[PDB]
Amino acid sequence: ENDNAPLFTRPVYEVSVRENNPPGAYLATVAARDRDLGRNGQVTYRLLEAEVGRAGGAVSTYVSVDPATGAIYALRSFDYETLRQLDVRIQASDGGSPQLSSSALVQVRVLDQNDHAPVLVHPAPANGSLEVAVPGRTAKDTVVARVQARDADEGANGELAFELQQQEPREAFAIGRRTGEILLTGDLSQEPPGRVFRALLVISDGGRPPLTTTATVSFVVT
Ligand X SMILES: *[C@H]1O[C@H](CO)[C@@H](O)[C@H](O)[C@@H]1O
Ligand Y SMILES: *[C@@H]1O[C@H](CO[C@@H]2O[C@@H](C)[C@@H](O)[C@@H](O)[C@@H]2O)[C@@H](O[C@@H]2O[C@H](CO)[C@@H](O[C@@H]3O[C@H](CO[C@H]4O[C@H](CO)[C@@H](O)[C@H](O)[C@@H]4O)[C@@H](O)[C@H](O)[C@@H]3O)[C@H](O)[C@H]2NC(C)=O)[C@H](O)[C@H]1NC(C)=O
Min separation Cβ 92 and ligand X, Å: 9
Q: Which is nearer to Ca ion, 66 or 112 (CB)?
A: 112
By CB under 6 A, residue 142 contacts ligand Y: no
**Residues pairing with 175 in the sheet:** 182
Site for Cl ion in 145-204 (CB under 5 A): none
Min separation Cβ 7 and Ca ion, Å: 10
By CB under 5 A, residue 24 contacts Cl ion: yes
Min separation Cβ 46 and ligand X, Å: 9
Contacts within 8 Å (CB) and 24+ apart, 49-54: 50/87, 50/89, 52/83, 52/86, 53/83, 53/86
Question: What does the CA dihedral 153, 89, 35, 9 come to, rounded to 10 degrees?
Answer: 30
Contacts within 8 Å (CB) and 24+ apart, 36-39: 36/2, 36/3, 36/4, 36/94, 36/96, 39/94, 39/95, 39/96
Whole-angstrom CA distances from 20 to 17, 28, 71, 111 are 9, 17, 20, 10
- Interface residue with Ca ion among 14, 51, 81, 131 (CB under 5 A) is 81
Given Cl ion, ligand Y, ligand X, none, residue 127, with its beta carbon under 5 to 8 Å by kind, binds ligand Y
Residue whose beta carbon is closest to ligand X: 101
How many CB atoms are closer than 10 A to CB 64?
17
Min separation Cβ 147 and Ca ion, Å: 16
Site for ligand X in 51-80 (CB under 6 A): none
- Interface residue with ligand X among 22, 98, 192, 194 (CB under 6 A) is 98
By CB under 6 A, residue 97 contacts ligand X: no
